[PDB]
PDB file of C-alpha atoms and ligand atoms in Angstrom:
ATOM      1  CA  UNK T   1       8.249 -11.461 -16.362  1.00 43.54           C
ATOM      2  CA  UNK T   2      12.229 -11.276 -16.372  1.00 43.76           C
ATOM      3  CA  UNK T   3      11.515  -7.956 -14.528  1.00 44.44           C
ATOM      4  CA  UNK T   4       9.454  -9.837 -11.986  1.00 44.88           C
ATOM      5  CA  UNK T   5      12.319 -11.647 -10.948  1.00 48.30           C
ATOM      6  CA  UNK T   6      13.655  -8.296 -10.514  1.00 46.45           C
ATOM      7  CA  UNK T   7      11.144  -7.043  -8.373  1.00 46.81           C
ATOM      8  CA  UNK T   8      11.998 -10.306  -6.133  1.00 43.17           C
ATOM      9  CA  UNK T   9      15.484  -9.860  -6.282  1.00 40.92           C
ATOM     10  CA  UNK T  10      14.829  -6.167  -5.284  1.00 38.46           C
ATOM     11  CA  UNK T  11      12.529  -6.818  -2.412  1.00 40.52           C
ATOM     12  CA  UNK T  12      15.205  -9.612  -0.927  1.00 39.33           C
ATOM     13  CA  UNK T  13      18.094  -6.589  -1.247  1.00 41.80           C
ATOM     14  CA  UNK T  14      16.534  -4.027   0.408  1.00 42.57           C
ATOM     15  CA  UNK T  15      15.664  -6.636   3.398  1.00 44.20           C
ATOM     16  CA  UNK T  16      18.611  -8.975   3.492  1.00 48.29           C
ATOM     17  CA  UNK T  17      20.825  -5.349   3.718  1.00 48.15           C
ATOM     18  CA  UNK T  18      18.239  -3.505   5.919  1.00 46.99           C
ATOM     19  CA  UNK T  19      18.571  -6.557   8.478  1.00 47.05           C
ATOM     20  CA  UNK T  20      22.322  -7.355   7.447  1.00 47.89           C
ATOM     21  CA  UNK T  21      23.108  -3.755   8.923  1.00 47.94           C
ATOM     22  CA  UNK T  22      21.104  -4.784  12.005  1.00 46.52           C
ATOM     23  CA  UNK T  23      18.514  -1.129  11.595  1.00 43.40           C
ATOM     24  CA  UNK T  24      15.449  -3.459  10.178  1.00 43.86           C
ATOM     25  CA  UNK T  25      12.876  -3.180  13.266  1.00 41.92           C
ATOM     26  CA  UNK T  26      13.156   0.721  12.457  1.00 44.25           C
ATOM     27  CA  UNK T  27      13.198   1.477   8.517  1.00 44.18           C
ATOM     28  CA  UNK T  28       9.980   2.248   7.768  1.00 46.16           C
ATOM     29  CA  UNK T  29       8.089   0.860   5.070  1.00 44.31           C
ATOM     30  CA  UNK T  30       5.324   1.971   3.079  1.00 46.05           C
ATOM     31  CA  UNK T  31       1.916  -0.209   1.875  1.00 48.33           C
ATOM     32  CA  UNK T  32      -1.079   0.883  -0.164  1.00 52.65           C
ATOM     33  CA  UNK T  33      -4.447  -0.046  -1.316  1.00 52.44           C
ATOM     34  CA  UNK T  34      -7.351   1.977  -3.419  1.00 48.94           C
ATOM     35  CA  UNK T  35     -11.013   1.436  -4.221  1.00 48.59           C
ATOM     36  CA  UNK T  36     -12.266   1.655  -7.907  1.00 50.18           C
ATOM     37  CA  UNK T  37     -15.612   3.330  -8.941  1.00 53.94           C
ATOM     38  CA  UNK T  38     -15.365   1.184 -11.930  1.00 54.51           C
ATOM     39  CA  UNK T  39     -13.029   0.839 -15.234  1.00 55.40           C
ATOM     40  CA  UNK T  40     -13.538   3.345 -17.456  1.00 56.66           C
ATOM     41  CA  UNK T  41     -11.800   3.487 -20.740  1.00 58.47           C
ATOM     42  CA  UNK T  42      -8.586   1.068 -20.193  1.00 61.01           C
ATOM     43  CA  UNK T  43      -8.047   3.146 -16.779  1.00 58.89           C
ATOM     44  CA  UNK T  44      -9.689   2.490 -13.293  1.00 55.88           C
ATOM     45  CA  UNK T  45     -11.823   5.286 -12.202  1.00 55.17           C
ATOM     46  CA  UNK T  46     -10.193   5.688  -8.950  1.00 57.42           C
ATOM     47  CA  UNK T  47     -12.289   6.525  -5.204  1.00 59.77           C
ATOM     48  CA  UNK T  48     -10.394   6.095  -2.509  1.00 62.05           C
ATOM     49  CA  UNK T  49      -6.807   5.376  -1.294  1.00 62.84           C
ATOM     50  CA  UNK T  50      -4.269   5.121   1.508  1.00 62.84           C
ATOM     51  CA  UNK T  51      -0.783   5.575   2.232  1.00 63.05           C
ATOM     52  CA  UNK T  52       0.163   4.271   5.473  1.00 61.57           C
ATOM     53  CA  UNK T  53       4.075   4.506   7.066  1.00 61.82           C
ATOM     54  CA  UNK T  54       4.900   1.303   9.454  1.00 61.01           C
ATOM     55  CA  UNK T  55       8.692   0.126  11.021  1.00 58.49           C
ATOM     56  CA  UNK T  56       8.421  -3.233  12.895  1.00 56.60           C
ATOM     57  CA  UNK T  57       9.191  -1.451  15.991  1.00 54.03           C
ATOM     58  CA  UNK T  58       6.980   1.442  16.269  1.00 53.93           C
ATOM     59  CA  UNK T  59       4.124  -0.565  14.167  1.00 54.23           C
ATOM     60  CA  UNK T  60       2.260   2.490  11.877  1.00 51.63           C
ATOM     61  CA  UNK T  61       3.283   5.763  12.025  1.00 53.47           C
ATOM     62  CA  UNK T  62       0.926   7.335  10.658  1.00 52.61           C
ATOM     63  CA  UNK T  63      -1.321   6.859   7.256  1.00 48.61           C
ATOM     64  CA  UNK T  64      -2.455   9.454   4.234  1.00 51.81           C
ATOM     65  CA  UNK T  65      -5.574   9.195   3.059  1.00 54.31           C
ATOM     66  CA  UNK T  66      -7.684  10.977   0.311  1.00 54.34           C
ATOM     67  CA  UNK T  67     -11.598  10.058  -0.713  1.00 53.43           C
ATOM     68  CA  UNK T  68     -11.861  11.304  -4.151  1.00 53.50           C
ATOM     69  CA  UNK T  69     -15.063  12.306  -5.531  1.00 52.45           C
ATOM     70  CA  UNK T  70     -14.062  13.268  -9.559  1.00 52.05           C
ATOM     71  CA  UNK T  71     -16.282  15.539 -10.996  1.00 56.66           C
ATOM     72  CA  UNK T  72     -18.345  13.037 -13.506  1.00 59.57           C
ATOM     73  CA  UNK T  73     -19.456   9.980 -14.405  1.00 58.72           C
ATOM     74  CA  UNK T  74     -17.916   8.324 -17.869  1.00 57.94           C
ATOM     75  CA  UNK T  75     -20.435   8.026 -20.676  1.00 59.86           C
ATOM     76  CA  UNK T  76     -20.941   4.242 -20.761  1.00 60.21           C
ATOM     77  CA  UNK T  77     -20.451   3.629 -17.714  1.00 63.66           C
ATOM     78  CA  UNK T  78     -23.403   4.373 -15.334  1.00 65.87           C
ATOM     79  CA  UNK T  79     -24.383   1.285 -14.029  1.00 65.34           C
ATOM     80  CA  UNK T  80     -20.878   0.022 -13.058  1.00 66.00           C
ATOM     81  CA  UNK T  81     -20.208   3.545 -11.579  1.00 68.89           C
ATOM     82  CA  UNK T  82     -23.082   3.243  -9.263  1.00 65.78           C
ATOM     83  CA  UNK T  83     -22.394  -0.491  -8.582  1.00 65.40           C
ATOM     84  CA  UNK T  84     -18.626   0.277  -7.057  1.00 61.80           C
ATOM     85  CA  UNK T  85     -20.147   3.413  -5.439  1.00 59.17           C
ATOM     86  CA  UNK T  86     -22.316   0.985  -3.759  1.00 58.32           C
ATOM     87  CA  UNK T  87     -19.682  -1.122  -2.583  1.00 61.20           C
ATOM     88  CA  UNK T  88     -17.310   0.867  -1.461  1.00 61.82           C
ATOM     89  CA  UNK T  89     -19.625   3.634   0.315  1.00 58.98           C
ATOM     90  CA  UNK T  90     -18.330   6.278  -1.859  1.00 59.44           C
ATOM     91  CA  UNK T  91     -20.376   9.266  -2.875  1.00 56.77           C
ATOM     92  CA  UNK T  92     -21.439   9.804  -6.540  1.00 55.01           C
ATOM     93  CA  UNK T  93     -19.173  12.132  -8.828  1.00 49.07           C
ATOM     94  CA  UNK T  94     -20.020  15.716  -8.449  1.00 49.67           C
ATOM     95  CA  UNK T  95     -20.147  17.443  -5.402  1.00 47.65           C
ATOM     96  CA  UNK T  96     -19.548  21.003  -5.471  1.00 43.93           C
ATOM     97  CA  UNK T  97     -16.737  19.676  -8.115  1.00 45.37           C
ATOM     98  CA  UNK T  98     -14.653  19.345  -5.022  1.00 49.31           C
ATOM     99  CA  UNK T  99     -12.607  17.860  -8.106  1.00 48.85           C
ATOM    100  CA  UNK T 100      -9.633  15.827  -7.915  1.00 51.09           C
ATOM    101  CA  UNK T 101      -6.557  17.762  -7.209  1.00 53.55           C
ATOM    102  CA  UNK T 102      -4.245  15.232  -9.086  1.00 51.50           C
ATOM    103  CA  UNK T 103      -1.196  17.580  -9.703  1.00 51.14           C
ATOM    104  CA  UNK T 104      -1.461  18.171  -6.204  1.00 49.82           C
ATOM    105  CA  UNK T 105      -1.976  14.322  -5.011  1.00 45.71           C
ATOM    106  CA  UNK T 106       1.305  13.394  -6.828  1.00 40.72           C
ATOM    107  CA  UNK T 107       3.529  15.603  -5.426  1.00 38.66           C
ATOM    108  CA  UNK T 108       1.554  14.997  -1.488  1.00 41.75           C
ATOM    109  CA  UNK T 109       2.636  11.697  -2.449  1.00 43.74           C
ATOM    110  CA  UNK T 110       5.971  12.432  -3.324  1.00 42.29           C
ATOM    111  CA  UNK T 111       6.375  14.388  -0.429  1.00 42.03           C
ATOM    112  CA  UNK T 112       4.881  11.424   2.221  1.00 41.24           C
ATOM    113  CA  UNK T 113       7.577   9.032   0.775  1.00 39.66           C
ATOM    114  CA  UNK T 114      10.697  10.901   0.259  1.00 41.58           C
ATOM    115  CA  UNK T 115      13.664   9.922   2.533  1.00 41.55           C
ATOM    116  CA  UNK T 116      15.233  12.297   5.673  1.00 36.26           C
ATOM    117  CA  UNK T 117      18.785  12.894   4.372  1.00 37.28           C
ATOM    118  CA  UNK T 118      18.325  10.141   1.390  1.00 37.91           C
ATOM    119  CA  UNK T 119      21.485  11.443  -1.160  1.00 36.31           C
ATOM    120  CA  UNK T 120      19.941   9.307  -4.466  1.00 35.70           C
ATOM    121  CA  UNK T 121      16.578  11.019  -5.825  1.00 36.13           C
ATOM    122  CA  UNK T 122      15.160   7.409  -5.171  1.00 30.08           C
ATOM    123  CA  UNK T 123      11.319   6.959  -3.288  1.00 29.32           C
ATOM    124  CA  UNK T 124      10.884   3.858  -1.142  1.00 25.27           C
ATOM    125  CA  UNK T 125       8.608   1.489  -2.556  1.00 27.13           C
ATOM    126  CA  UNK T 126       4.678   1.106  -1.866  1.00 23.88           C
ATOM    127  CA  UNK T 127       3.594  -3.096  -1.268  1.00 23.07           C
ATOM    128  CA  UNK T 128       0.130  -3.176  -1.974  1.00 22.48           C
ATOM    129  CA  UNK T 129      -1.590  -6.745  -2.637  1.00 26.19           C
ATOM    130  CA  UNK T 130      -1.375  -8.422  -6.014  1.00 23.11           C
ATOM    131  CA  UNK T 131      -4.782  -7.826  -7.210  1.00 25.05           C
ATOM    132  CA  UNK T 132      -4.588  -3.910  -6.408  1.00 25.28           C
ATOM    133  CA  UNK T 133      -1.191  -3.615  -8.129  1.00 27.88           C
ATOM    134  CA  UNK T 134      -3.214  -2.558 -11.723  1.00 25.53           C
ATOM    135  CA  UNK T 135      -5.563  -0.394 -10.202  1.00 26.12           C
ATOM    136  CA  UNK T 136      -2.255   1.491  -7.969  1.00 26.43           C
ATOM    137  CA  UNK T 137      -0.174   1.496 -11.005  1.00 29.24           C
ATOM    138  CA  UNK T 138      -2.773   3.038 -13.203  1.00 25.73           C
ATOM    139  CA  UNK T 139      -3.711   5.580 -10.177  1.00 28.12           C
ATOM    140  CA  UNK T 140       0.136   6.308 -10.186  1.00 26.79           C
ATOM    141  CA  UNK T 141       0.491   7.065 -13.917  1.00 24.56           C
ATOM    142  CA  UNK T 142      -2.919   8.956 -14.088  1.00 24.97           C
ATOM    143  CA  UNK T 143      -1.572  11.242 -12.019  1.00 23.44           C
ATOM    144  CA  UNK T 144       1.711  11.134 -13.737  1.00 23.52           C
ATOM    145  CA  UNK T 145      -0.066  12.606 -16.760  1.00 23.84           C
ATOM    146  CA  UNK T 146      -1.090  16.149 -15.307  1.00 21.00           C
ATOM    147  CA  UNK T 147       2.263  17.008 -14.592  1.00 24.34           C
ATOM    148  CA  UNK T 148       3.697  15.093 -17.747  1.00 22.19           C
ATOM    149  CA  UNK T 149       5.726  13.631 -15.379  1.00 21.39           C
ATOM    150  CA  UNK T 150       7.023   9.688 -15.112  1.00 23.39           C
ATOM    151  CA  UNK T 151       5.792   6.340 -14.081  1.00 24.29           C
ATOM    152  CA  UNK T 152       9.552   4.895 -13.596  1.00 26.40           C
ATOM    153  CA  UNK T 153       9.605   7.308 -10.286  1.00 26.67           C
ATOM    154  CA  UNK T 154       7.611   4.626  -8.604  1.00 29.62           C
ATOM    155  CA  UNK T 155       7.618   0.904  -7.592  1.00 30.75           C
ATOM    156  CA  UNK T 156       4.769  -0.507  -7.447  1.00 32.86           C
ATOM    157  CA  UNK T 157       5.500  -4.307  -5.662  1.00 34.79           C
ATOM    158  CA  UNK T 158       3.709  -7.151  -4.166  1.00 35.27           C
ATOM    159  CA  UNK T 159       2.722  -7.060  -0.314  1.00 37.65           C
ATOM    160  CA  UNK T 160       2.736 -10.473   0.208  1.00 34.48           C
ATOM    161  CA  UNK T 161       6.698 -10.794  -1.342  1.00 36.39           C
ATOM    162  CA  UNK T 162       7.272  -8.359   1.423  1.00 38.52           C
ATOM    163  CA  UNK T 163       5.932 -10.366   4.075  1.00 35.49           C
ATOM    164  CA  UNK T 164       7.733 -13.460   2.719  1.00 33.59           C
ATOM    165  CA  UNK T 165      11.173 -11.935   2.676  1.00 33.27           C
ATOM    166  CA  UNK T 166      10.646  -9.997   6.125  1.00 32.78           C
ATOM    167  CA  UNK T 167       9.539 -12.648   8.185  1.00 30.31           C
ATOM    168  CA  UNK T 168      12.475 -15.206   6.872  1.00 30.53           C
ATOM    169  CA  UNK T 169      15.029 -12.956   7.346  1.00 26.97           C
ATOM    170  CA  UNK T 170      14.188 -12.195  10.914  1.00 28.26           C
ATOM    171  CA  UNK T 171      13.732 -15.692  11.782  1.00 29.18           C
ATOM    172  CA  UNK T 172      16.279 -16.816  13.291  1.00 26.93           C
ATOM    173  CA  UNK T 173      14.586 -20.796  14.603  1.00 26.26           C
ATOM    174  CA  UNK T 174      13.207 -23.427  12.093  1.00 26.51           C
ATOM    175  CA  UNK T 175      10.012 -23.160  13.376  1.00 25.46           C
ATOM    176  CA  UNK T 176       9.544 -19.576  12.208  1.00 24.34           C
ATOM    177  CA  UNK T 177       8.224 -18.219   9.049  1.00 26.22           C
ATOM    178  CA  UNK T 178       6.975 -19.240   5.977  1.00 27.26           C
ATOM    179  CA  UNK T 179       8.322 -22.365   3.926  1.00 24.73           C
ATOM    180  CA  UNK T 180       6.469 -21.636   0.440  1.00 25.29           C
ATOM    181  CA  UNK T 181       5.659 -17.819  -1.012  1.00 25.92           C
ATOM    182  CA  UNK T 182       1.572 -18.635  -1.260  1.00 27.66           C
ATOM    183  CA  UNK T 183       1.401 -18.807   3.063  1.00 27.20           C
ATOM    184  CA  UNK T 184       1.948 -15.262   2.163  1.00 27.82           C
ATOM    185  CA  UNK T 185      -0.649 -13.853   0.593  1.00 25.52           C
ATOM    186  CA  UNK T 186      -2.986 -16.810   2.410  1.00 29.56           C
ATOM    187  CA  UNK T 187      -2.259 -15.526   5.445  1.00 30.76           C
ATOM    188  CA  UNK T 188      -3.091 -11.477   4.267  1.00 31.92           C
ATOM    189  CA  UNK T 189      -6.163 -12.751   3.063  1.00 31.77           C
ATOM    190  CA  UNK T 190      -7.140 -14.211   6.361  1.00 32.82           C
ATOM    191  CA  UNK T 191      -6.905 -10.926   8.219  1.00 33.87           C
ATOM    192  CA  UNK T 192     -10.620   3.207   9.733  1.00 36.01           C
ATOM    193  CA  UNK T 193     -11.426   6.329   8.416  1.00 38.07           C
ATOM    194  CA  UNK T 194     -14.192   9.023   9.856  1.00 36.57           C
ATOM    195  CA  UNK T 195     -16.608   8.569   6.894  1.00 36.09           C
ATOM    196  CA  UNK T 196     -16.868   4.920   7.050  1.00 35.32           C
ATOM    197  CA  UNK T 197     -16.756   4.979  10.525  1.00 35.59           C
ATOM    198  CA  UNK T 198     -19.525   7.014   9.832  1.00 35.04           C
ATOM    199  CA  UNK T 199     -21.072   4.850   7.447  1.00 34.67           C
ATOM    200  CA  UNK T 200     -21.125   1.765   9.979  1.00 37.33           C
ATOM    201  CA  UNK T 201     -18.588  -0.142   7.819  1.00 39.70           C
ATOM    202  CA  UNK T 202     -15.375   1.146   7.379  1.00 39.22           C
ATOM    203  CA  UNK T 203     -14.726  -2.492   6.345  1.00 38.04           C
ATOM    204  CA  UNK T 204     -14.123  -1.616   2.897  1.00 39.86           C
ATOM    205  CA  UNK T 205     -12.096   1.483   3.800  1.00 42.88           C
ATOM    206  CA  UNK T 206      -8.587   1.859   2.407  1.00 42.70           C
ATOM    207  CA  UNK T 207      -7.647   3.202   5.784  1.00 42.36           C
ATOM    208  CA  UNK T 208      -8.748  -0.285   7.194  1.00 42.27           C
ATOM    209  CA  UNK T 209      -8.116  -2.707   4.305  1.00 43.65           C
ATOM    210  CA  UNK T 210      -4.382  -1.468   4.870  1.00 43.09           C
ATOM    211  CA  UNK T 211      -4.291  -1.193   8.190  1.00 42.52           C
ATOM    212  CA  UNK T 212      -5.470  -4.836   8.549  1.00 43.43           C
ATOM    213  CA  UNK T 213      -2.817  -6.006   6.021  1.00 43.80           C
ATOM    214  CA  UNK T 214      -0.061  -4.699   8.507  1.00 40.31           C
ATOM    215  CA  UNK T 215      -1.521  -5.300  11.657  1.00 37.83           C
ATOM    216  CA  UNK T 216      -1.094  -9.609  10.713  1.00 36.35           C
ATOM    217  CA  UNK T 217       2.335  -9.234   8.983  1.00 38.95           C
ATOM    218  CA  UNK T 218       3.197  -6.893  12.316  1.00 42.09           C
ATOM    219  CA  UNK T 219       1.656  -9.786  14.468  1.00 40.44           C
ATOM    220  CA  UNK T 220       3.934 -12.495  12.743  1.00 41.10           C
ATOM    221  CA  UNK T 221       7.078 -10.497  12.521  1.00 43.50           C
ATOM    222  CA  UNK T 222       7.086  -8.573  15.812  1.00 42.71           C
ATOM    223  CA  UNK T 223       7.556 -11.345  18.781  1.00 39.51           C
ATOM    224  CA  UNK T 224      10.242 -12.549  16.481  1.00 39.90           C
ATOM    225  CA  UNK T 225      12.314  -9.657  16.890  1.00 36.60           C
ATOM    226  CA  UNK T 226      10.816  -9.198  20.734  1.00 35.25           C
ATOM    227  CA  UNK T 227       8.288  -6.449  20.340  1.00 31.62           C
ATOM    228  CA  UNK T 228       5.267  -5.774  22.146  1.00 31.15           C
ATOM    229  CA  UNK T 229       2.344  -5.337  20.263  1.00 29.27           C
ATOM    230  CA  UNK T 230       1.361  -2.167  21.529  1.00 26.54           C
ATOM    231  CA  UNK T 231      -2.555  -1.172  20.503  1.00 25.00           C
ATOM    232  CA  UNK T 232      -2.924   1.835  18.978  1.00 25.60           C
ATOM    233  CA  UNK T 233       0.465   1.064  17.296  1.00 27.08           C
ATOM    234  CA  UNK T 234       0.946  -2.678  16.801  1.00 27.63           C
ATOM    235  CA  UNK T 235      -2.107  -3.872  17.827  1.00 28.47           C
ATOM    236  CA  UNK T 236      -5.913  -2.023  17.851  1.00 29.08           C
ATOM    237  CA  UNK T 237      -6.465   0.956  20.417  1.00 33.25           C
TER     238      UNK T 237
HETATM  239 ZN1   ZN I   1     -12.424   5.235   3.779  1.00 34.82          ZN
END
């Protein structure tokens, strides 16, 4: 995990610099989650995700989300198919074959996080938390796969190390922030879209599980820097 340091020492430089050249409140930052069907044959049978755009000023932008309904069911793998299905409110494989438009999902990707005038053919990362990090990896190269194209494009870091490093360069007074790494992630675990919302709960929507990971590191890292928590933006409403 030499390269794990390097995802550390990567997170700190692009917020040290980002607040160093006093434009942090406004760079916008980009967090995902997914929901799994089930793991199917050493990759995670993917149903869900969101991409969601935030800057600590304006709070989220605006979020992309896809349900994805692929056209079968893995032979094996039945029972654990319908067991996530049943979790996460998605809809059973087949219908209509409205079939996962992966080559196309890449690149609507690749278009969501590319730069305005960036000069370096260089994406922004996506901070999703820890335990999604296999499942968003393996969604990332899946799709990497119908267009033989390459993993490396993408970094795929921890939300929580985000949080961490925003908050404590921001800080300013001693009583701010976090003093150890694991207040992090403690504090994302202690705090939709039209289908769920739909379906009652819309509690285990991507759309929300993100949107609730941003709305508490928002709500920690916001008065800090003097914002209101607007609803609708910072805030609900
Ligand atoms: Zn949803």
């Amino acid at each position: 995990k030499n390269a794990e340091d390097n995802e550390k020492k990567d997170i700190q430089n692009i917020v040290k610099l980002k607040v160093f050249d006093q434009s942090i409140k406004t760079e916008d930052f980009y967090v995902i989650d997914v929901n799994s069907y089930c793991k199917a044959n050493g990759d995670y049978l993917i149903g869900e995700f969101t991409v969601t755009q935030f800057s600590l000023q304006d709070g989220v932008k605006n979020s992309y989300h896809e349900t994805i309904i692929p056209s079968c069911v893995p032979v094996g793998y039945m029972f654990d198919v319908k067991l996530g299905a049943e979790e996460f409110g998605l809809e059973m494989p087949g219908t209509d074959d409205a079939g996962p438009n992966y080559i196309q999902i890449l690149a609507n990707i690749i278009d969501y996080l590319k730069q305005k005038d960036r000069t370096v053919q260089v994406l922004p990362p996506m901070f999703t938390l820890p335990e999604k990090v296999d499942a968003v990896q393996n969604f990332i190269s899946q799709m990497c796969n119908c267009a033989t194209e390459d993993d490396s494009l993408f970094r795929i870091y921890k939300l929580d190390t985000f949080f961490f490093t925003l908050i404590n360069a921001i800080s300013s007074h001693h009583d701010e922030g976090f003093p150890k790494e694991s207040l992090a992630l403690t504090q994302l675990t202690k705090d939709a879209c039209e289908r769920h919302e739909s379906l009652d709960k819309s509690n285990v929507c991507t759309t929300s599980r993100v949107k609730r990971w941003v709305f508490t590191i928002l709500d920690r890292c916001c008065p800090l820097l003097g914002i209101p928590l607007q609803p609708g933006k910072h805030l609900p409403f």
